[PDB]
Amino acid sequence: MMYKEPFGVKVDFETGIIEGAKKSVRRLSDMEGYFVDERAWKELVEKEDPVVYEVYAVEQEEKEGDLNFSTHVIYPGKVGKEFFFAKGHFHAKLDRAQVAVALKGKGGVLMQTPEGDAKWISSEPGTVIYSPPYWAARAVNIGDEPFIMLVIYPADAGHDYGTIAEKGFSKIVIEENGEVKVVDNPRW
Amino acid sequence: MMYKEPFGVKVDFETGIIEGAKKSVRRLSDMEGYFVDERAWKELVEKEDPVVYEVYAVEQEEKEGDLNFSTHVIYPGKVGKEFFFAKGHFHAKLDRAQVAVALKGKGGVLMQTPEGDAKWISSEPGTVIYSPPYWAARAVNIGDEPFIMLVIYPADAGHDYGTIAEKGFSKIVIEENGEVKVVDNPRW
Asked: Has keyword Metal-binding (chains A, B)?
């Protein structure tokens, strides 16, 4: 009683690349307003404009019950004290969850509710993170190598980047004197 | 605007174990009628009754949009010529898909539509297999070590084991003289 063809694809656990996937590259210049230290942001864009992260997505038509998957490859770096991260988004159908599996590197996921309650969970390779319905997720790279996650999410979840674009997350992930810290975002 | 708490859990890529997960163990005796060679089945049950596979499942309430995940650990072995495999099931809400990621070992996924059209896709570690809406999936271990997959599926998909329990899959995965073959199931 069905129809779509099953397929397999290789995921390179070392680079995060999925051949034939929709590839999205976001440089620091693509993330204006995302980091707390705007002066440090401007300076890094001017000097280098580094790739912050790549997404390789395998997506289906937006149909209830179906599933998408992608890799998030967060490159290592900081803007001032603040580690490189994915932009983060809510789902357009808010009550969709997502599951993320760490494949490589040192990092974690910062998650937030629509009211701004945040929670950080670290993820060494092998760790699976459950981001429940109504939460937005942001992978963060706290190490010196690429941090790579495999993310599975419902095909009808959609994306809402705008809320995060304007308000950010209520907590930030920084390093000071070798101490990785999750602290209140000053701009809240 | 929400509520469930995010969590992370470790998955041991070598054993497939998830601590605190719902653990299901199925021995050969639990799989009567699943293998083509009933005499070889009886003999192996009598001599040893080996564990065929384990599932470690992290499941949510059955709610649209939410997600479950589990590991399938298929132990190595054969019943006559036929490799050890998971039972296989359709989803109770048929149009739910699933995504499986190979973590360890040598194996693949055999999939079938409600009309019995089957497709085999091998999966070395690193391979992601997409089982579309309406398909039933069965992981098969074609090697000499445990074959382990991480499977993500919708929390409201449900399980329908009965169809497969009575009819099986239209193809079987066997080895003859060192040749791994996917052939027609004689009993169809």
From this structure: yes
